[model samples]
Target: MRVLVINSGSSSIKYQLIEMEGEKVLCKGIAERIGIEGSRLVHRVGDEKHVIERELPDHEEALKLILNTLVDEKLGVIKDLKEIDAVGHRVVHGGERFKESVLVDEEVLKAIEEVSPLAPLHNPANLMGIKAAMKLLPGVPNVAVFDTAFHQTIPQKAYLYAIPYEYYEKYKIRRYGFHGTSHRYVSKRAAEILGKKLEELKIITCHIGNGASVAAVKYGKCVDTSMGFTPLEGLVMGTRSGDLDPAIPFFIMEKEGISPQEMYDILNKKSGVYGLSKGFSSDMRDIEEAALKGDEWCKLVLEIYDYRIAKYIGAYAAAMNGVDAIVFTAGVGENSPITREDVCSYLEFLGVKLDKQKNEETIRGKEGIISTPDSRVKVLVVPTNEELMIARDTKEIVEK
Candidate 1:
């Protein structure tokens, strides 16, 4: 069976076509800048890349272009659209309704739409991808692979906020951690790399990037996570403020005379490392360079970021009583050795003795263990493969 995996954003659509026979990726690409100027699609079949420059008015148009490229005579991976057995979409929020991947239907679509308020930037775009794929793929099944699915195992004590019970009961408002897909993938990968059973170990999987979250996986199930209700709750990210006293926002709002919406915009888009570095680029690589050059706030920015991560890791260790392994994945987690080192340096108590020498290739683009073999708690660098997980779930549901 062949599965087409899609991760749709507000202005872009990322896709990968996989032939599940060997779990091989046939082709992968992304259409960028839909509805904006200078839109283009960069498609790759193996190592060869083909660029399609066009004006993508919307996701439907982008999907159409992607289908055409999939059958392009020279760079095509498959001869026809019929060869695609199913489509998998990456959804940001699934609310309390979906605990796992499910075949997309009207009921499922409505449930996702119902939870759009929780992920204003993501779910609607995800729905667009599912709608486009379903329209174009006729009889082929399309599945929704939610980022919140893996976190469904979290206990109420961990997921619920200390809010009015009426609020949670009436609004279904509570913590629903994001990055469930990445967390799920890396936690299992960590176990495999350590030659240990996932259910036999306690792991803290950190998925850090422009957005970050940490999950405590105990006995192969998520027991706790840093992200609460939304991606905005976790670590200091590219622009989002992580954990801060709830009263801080109210205090700032009254002093600045800004509306709640305005304050929220500041927290989600104007804070974090961006604000810490005083409007410098949010990209960690740039921040790393500036820090080496003694740019103001760069070192402090990194110190705070790394420290918060370490702080959470320690908290989870305490939550689980102990941790058997620490797995790092996603952009910042896998690539930034400085971040990893800075974070792990404070975690010696967890027996996470960093192998500074092996840390260079930590981005190893693949699975690699960066801790010394004798380190009591293993530290692994597992690059996240969320698209592959989406493809697998889609294939399983469709084949069944």
Candidate 2:
């Protein structure tokens, strides 16, 4: 069966077409700048890339272009849309209702919409893509593979805040960790790489991308995660301020005479390494390069970011009682050797002795153990494949 995985963002739709027979990606691409000018679709089949510049006024229009590209005479992967057996959508939030991936129906859509307040930036866009795919693909089943579903196993004590029980009961205000798809994939894959059973091992999966989170996966279940309530509650990310004093936003709003929304924008968009480095850059590569050049601010913020990640790992280690392996996935987690080194340096107590040569050698889609042979706890670099996980879930559900 062929499954099309869609990860819709506010202004973009990232998709991958995979054939489940061998779990191979048939084609993958993205339509960028929906609802705005300079909209275009970059589609790839194997190593060949094709760019179609067009005006994507909405997700429907963008998806129409994508479907067309899929069956394009010269650049197509499939001859017709009918070849697509299922569509899997990466829905960012499923609330407490969905514990796993499910076939999208009116009820599912409604439940996702109801939880939009918890993920104001993501759920609505995901719904748009799901609706668009359902409209365009008629009889094909579209599955909603939530980013929150895998972390639904989190215990109440770990997910709850100290705010108020009434608030949580009334508003469902609790931690619903994001990047669960990545964490789920990596944790399971880590077991495979280590030749161990996932249910028998305690693993901490760190997904360090533009937005980052660390999950404490004990016996294949998420016991605790760094990202809480929303993605903003985790490690310092590209622009989003990770964990901050809860009162800082209010204090800044009162002092700056700004609205709550303005304060939120500052925290969500202007903070993190970007804010800490005084707006030098949001990209870690740039920051790392600057730090190498002896830039003081860049150097300081890099340590700050790495330090926060180490602290979370330590916290989760304590939470899980002990960790058997540490799996690093996502962008920085897989690529940035310096960041990994800095973080693991703080984790020596956990017997995480990094093989400097191996750590620096693992990048550009490479996955392997980075810790020394004698290290008590294994440290691995596992590049995450969230789309594949979604596709697998979609295929399983549709087949069911």
Candidate 3:
């Protein structure tokens, strides 16, 4: 079966066409600068890359270009649009309405639209891709694969914030985690690598990317996660201030004479590792490099940054009673040996024994176990494959 997976952002659309027999990627590409100047599409087929410089005024136009290139004579993978079995869209939020991937229909579309307020920056862009695909291929099956659905298993006590009951009743404000696909994918991979059944193992998955979150998967289901009401509630990410006192924002707002909007902008954009490490970058590698050079600020901030992950893992250990395997995925988690080592160092008491040589020698984008044989809680580095997860869900729903 052939499935086309799409992740539509506000300005660009990232796509992949996979032939699921061996789960091979026939082609993948990105349509960038949509509705802006110098719009272009870069599609990769086999070992070759194709670039099309054209003005894409909207998602409709961009998707039309995607279809044209999918079957382009010199840069094509399939001969016709019909060869594509289904379209899978990455919808950022499904709220409480969707607990699993679903066939896109009027009701599904309406539910997705209703949840747009929860993910204003993502769901609307996702709908554009869905609507465009449905119009272009009216007979084809399109699926809405949500990032929040995997976390729906979280119990009420864990998801509900300590606030006015009326506020939650009226607004549905609660912990709806992001990066569910990455967390879900890595946890399953960790179980596979550990030679354990997913349902029998308790897992802590740290998806440490520019935008990060940690999820505690207890018995193959999410019990709790770091990310709360929004992405801003999780680990200190590229620019997001993760967990902090709710009173901090208001205090700053009053002292600086700033509005709530500006305060939000600061918390969500001006903070995190970027703000913590003075004159350094939010990218962990940059901070790591500066730290190695004996840069004082980088040294301090990187310790705090890496330690935050360690602290969260410790807390999650208590949250799930115990964790069998700890999985690190996404960009920094998979690539940074220093980060993996630092995080594991703090967990020695909990039976996390780091294989220093193995951790130091491990490379990025590869799947491997990084803990010593004697370690009680296994440490693993698994690369995230969210696109493949979406395609798998899309195929199952379409086949059903």
Winning candidate number (lDDT): 2
lDDT of 3 by residue, 146-191 (tens): 8999899999989998898887899999999989888998899888
lDDT scores for all predictions? 0.90, 0.92, 0.90
Query: What lDDT tens digits, residue by residue, belong to model 1 across residues 218-291?
Result: 99999998888777887889999999998999999999999999999999899998888888878877898989
Q: Of 2 and 3, which scores higher on lDDT? A: 2
Looking at candidate 1, what is the lDDT of residue 84? 92
Alpha carbon RMSD to native, model 2: 1.1
Rank candidates by TM-score, best first: 3, 2, 1
Once superposed on the true structure, which residue ranges of model 1 sit more than 4 Å away at CA? none
lDDT value, candidate 1, whole model = 0.90
Q: What is the TM-score of each candidate against the true structure?
A: 0.96, 0.98, 0.98
Alpha-carbon RMSD, each predicted model: 1.5, 1.1, 1.1
The TM-score of candidate 3 is 0.98
Clashing residue pairs for model 3: none
